[PDB]
Design a protein around this ligand. Structure first.
Ligand SMILES: [Mg+2]
Ligand SMILES: [Mg+2]
Ligand SMILES: [Mg+2]
Ligand SMILES: [Mg+2]
Lengths: 93, 94, 94, 93
């Protein structure tokens, strides 16, 4: 099972255009829109390959893709961000 | 950090299946906060004192709600990731 | 086109107060379509054949759901616009 | 009561930076996020001046503001767009 840092870095291999940061933010919003549709239509559950198009699962995945792509573009390590949040959570507490 | 364990760990303390709209509202809220952080140029890997309101934090918060929504809608993100890579490959592989 | 009449005219054919989440989903859908139209640079005032998928059309569609949500949530956009201009003025006027 | 073209053009008078188109799109998303919060918290109805902050009304208004601001930035006449949509609707039909 893939690590989040591995997903980020695979994405960075084939989809990383630092001169076009805005692209990735536009894409995030597009996928959030597609997600909204898929939830509106109740396309829940875990699809098979054939059921994947337009499913909530696919759209959640596409949002995730752009979260990772934006992290690459903006010099963010998500796993390291989590650790720092843990530090803050522990003082809270 | 792995996708299934992350989803699952969040599910342990934040799972209210009777409140599915809540998770969608929250996603949109974090995406707006993300938008603000990008607009303000709060990029890079923040130190502890820079964390709050950083692009980094807001990306995490969006990720959090992606995982929380996946739990709510019966979705396994890891399985879905695998199917998405299979579909791409079947589309284009010789 | 005036804000109250626009809201009201939409209310005539599209008002389902039992389906308030519907209008919020639709807003987010149109905002995503707007995002695509801006990304693709489909700006300017389109002719009839350019209308579908133009930044112009998607801005209208977002506006539509803003008005539809206002109806749903008991909001008068015109009155609200007036109060917002009053508030700005009370904030800064000498 | 103000026309939509008057709202667009008032906004254009005090908030129009064509070299910063992206700003307006970021702002639209910010206000959509604030809107989401205000609906989540059920802050419906028509506020008075004192109740305006954080209300659904204010947030819907702020989204509208950015719809008009984006229309200015992207050379869009909303009223003219409506007329053209009417033409298309009438063929539909
Ligand atoms: Mg998609
Ligand atoms: Mg946040
Ligand atoms: Mg549309
Ligand atoms: Mg606001």
């Amino acid at each position: 099972h893939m690590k989040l840092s591995e997903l980020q870095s695979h994405i960075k291999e084939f989809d990383y255009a630092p001169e076009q940061s805005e692209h990735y933010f536009f894409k995030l919003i597009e996928e959030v829109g597609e997600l909204s549709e898929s939830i509106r239509k109740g396309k829940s559950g875990q699809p098979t390959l054939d059921e994947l198009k337009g499913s909530v699962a696919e759209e959640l995945y596409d949002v995730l893709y752009y979260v990772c792509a934006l992290a690459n573009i903006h010099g963010v390590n998500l796993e390291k961000t989590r650790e720092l949040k843990e530090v803050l959570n522990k003082v809270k507490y």
